[PDB]
């Protein structure tokens, strides 16, 4: 199934960032993935101090690996990302563009519920 890997990497320079992206992608292709695209959301400050691999990170570089993988490779990829020390946070999810949008007619009005109690005197 088609997956998306959200990758927060360390705030590094261009050669080290390229080397880390290269390592992650060739890892994916050795585990058995065919990679669709690499996207760069860019370097930005983290929402909170993420502590990973005995370092306290304040900023990070956000990337996406949109790819396609067999079923039993996600676990191996997660273990490899956990062992990598330049990945601040890596997450593999099913693809939002593979889940399809359903057409909506609109919000249906709900009435007031009737006949909840008997019509006795009480």
């Amino acid at each position: 199934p088609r997956y998306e890997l959200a990758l927060i990497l360390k705030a590094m320079q261009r050669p080290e960032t390229a080397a880390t992206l290269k390592r992650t992608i060739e890892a994916l292709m050795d585990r058995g993935a065919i990679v669709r695209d690499l996207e760069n959301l860019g370097e930005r400050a983290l929402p909170y101090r993420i502590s990973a691999h005995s370092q306290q990170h304040n900023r990070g570089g956000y990337f996406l690996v949109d790819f396609y993988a067999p079923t039993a490779a996600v676990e191996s990829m997660v273990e490899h990302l956990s062992r990598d020390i330049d990945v601040i946070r890596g997450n593999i999810v099913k693809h939002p563009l593979t889940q399809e949008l359903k057409e909506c007619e609109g919000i249906v009005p709900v009435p007031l519920a009737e006949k909840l109690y008997s019509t006795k005197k009480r």
């Binding site: 909170y48 993420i50 502590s51």
Partner: protein
């Protein structure tokens, strides 16, 4: 503890109305329901009691919105007597 320190639940005082700013902050916490969360988490509410309290609050909410709707619907009829001498 890992977030930025001076952003969440922070209000600024304007010309020195520190009492007004404290009222504003208390209003923030009341509208977000943080204060009642603190009062209910001072002691442990067992899950059956939590469920009884939430069901009771929901029934009270339903009744109070219906009652307020009726009141606002009848305040227009709350006028002076149109035909006084019957």
């Amino acid at each position: 503890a890992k977030h930025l320190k001076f952003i969440a639940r922070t209000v600024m005082v304007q010309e020195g109305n520190v009492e007004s700013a404290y009222r504003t902050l208390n209003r923030i916490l009341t509208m977000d329901g943080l204060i009642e969360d603190i009062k209910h988490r001072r002691y442990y509410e067992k899950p059956c009691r939590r469920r009884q309290r939430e069901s009771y609050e929901r029934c009270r909410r339903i009744y109070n919105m219906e009652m307020a709707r009726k009141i606002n619907f009848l305040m227009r009829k709350n006028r002076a007597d149109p035909w006084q001498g019957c």
